Subunit: 319 residues, 4 copies
């Protein structure tokens, strides 16, 4: 290919920029031009495409968000829509396209491909739940943002011997919850992937109470409910003072950590490769510490599961 493109759709996440720079340079290294697609798919259809000069991506490897922006486009859900984009692409000479974002980005990746247009997806989401990859760009950066709050909230959670409930993110996934909570010495972690009996969860609270430790920290994935509620439920069931904190989009910003800047660069570059190599309709990820690339279709077919043994661990490591 002579020139390819890059766009980021879905919720932004820390590291996408790394991935952007990776893609841009790695491409520029093989003497390929990279055009930037602004405002995710929406801009694709709108025809928002500016040539990305090597100058543009240097100096942002350490930045949160996406210099390319990312919107939500409904039009890009219909033939007539995808087509109007597949043309705007050709309009500028573009021959392939790199997509960085959530699983919704893949839907387009696939369709766009089913129309005879080379598209690879790079997993970029703090939720850590795109299939075909153990981690996603932004996960370590969110997990670290969270455990960092769990640490600050633990200082004061101890000071007033209060019981705490942090509300994380990762929608229908318990990853930012599990990994995080474990990482924080969370007395209990509530995630989708596994069942929890709110009664027992309140029994141990009373138990671990007698044991001397009056401050407890409950980590709840927003996927299984709402901290706010769980808060009141615990305060009334027990009697222990209680506060509730919903971190928020803070789990979406900030400069990315080591692991995410690397992963972003390795995957981002591993995408430019699959295109120039002819392959299309592929998604790049990392499994068992190894760069893998799958079929967006057979890839989405799978489910997102967590390591139950970890949820288990976190249970035995807090009594």
């Amino acid at each position: 290919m002579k020139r390819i493109g890059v766009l980021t759709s879905g919720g932004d996440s820390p590291g996408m920029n790394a991935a952007i720079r990776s893609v841009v340079r790695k491409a520029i290294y093989h003497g390929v031009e990279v055009y930037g697609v602004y405002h995710g798919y929406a801009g694709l259809i709108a025809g928002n495409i500016k040539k990305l000069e090597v100058g543009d991506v240097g100096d942002i490897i350490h930045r949160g968000g996406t210099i390319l922006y990312t919107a939500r486009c409904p039009e890009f859900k219909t033939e007539e829509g995808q087509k109007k984009g597949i043309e705007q692409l050709k309009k500028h000479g573009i021959e392939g396209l790199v997509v960085i974002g959530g699983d919704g980005s893949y839907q387009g990746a696939k369709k766009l491909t089913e129309h005879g247009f080379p598209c690879v997806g790079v997993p970029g989401t703090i939720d850590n739940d795109i299939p075909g990859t153990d981690f996603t760009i932004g996960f370590d950066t969110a997990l670290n943002t969270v455990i960092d709050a769990i640490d600050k909230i633990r200082d004061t959670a101890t000071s007033h011997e209060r019981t705490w409930v942090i509300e994380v993110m990762g929608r229908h996934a318990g990853d930012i919850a599990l990994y995080s909570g474990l990482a924080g010495g969370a007395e209990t972690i509530l995630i989708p992937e596994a069942d929890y009996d709110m009664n027992d969860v309140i029994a141990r609270l009373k138990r671990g109470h007698e044991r001397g430790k009056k401050h407890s920290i409950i980590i709840v994935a927003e996927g299984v409910g709402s901290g706010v509620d769980f808060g009141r439920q615990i305060q009334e069931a027990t009697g222990f003072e209680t506060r509730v904190t919903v971190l928020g989009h803070v789990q979406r910003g900030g400069s990315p950590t080591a692991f995410d800047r690397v992963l972003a660069s390795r995957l981002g570059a591993r995408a430019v490769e699959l295109l120039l190599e002819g392959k299309g309709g592929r998604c790049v990820g990392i499994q068992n510490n190894q760069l893998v690339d799958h079929d967006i279709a057979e890839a989405l077919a799978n489910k997102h599961t967590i390591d139950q043994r970890m949820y288990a661990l976190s249970k035995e490591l807090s009594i």
Copy 2:
């Protein structure tokens, strides 16, 4: 003196441990024994006191919160209950008490003195609302956890061209906001110290939209309502995709920044200084960049304010 105790009442802030250490150290440097009145005034009644050794308050200078704990206590706001207070101090041979906390702690220091117990107060609250001190221990730290969150949020707020409403603490004061907002370059800071107007805001909030900047950050001093409400408000009035984030208690925990460590050590050291110099019914606080002494009563009679000129600058600079 011979023996002097220390306690932390009210909401814990970053820098108390620092101030504690500075007391436990400054006093020992004068052969004065100290004591920990644990769990705020709750212990001063319960008799939860202990001896503090220089090896105890050492290595805790960087820790958020208070080792001595804190908790509310109504029995003390009375008299019949505060009588067991002076006694739990007598029986132990304590002569002077160093109080660290909010405007509410000062009370248990204004009454104890008017009872024959030298008491000194040390501003330890993130709100920055204590009278008789430009800055209270914890402020700069909290004030920093806030801007460190504004920075992650502007990330995801810039990538999605969204409008934001940040809910910052500080109860009835607008310091944690006016400052952070200004620091984090917000487009609008709403504090109880100044009359705003959603009509004037939504007017400027829009001009900036069409002008060029499609994302805005709105810091709201939790003392003017809720963010959620302004969120849903900004939303309905503009159609603008909006989100709200309530940082919350994270602003209370964390490792104190440099400025609180230095202040918590200077104030806990100027406080102990008085419990020796004799006068024991005062409270310390850095005023005009100088350590000053104040009559717990002649100071608490004052009202905390903000630098209008500073708020007026947030107006000019942000537009």
Copy 3:
């Protein structure tokens, strides 16, 4: 005043931006086109002056360094160059100027006022060695970067019961060293503004090591010597395991801390007000929590000096 300029000369410092931002924004608020001279006075000669828009300075309030770039240039010390300087100044129609940077620039700020051209200076530097202000842009940020490192070191030093000697910057000034350790928890702070007897330093580390603390953090202001040397002299006299760590320009960068961003804003805005209020040859700064402004003359006549009362403190809380 209808079109002022803004350049930065000297070592960059986390904050210079919050200020450039503040300068421009403020200026525009008053209808005064703002141009930026790149690479300090050096560029002023070259005529490296470009117009600045409110957009240019949008989203840099939280970045370190100076987007305006900085650089040395002896030229501007010889009036032959100063002559070439006023040239580029009126060549582009620049009436007034705002110098951000170390004191090495102040000199050039005064001179320009003599050639009949406005010139206000903004104290920007991590050393905190500019007369006329208690704090300079970059101090608190740098002052922080350090303590973050002492916290880190303290861990590795503790587990290995080792004696350490960190080396902070600040030229001939001791500020960075002083506030660092004090908040850092150092046992010794060697600064230029105070005398020390290495014999005493050993006498302490050798007495403390005999007691409970089997590790210490010796902060050494780069201005008095080199940590690599005291680290040698110390591991010789005491025979204690020792390591020396020299914090580099990691102190020169980072993202301005709360206190810093604000100060920069305040000092930068007030910088524009002066130029317009017809003043000149002055220089803003903060003294006694008040926004002051002196003449670049009567100021430099004064001399920067740490607060001994704090050093003696740094010594007392140690023992």
Copy 4:
């Protein structure tokens, strides 16, 4: 088994405590009571033991260093010492043992075993230079600590157009330097695992300084020489002012990132499981995101290497 011991030998790293934590909790949860051996093998020999109460490992899962302490100890390399230890252990009813640390401690791990003693390894070191694992407790934290420093240096390096050299640790391994550079975006990384023509290097820099790449950052693993040398050496041949910073031991301290807490917890209790699951003379680790365990012997017999692909990747993403 009813009683086991845990010890930290070798250079401390962030996460060791978190790892201690699980080895203590996982034990308690299984009835086994765990005795903590302070000061590594040196402490074993001296008989420094103490029962680890469940409340001891409480609130340390976010701390650096090792609550246990570490030291180097030749006496254990001799036959006289290994016998002194087998004796001290069997004196306090110790049946198995937990050893966390570098490849050094692994030795004694394998020793104690031959002398009939169940010991399990746990990769603890920021070097990531230990065999039988893709990662070691500390790598990640040191990895960010490095990239955070590179982000600051990039600021001043940029403001002044300075070519920079950063000397990172890792003894003989190039892991820290590889990932750091790759993730900090170093224009050139130098390591022990791959040759480098210090000529080509210069050549590239000489080409960038012309292509607006007026500033670069070189990462030198310490096991490839001193950055101070390469520093002056680059300045000499090119002429661009250069600066060198040796992060020193700030790479060893500070609180551990999310990952390291997850890995340590996972590994610790995984070691504990082996002591009970009747194993021994083995070492746990994480290869290909799988908690596998190996024999301390055949494992140490193996060698450590880096991923050439990354280095190559690091050379393309930089020009």
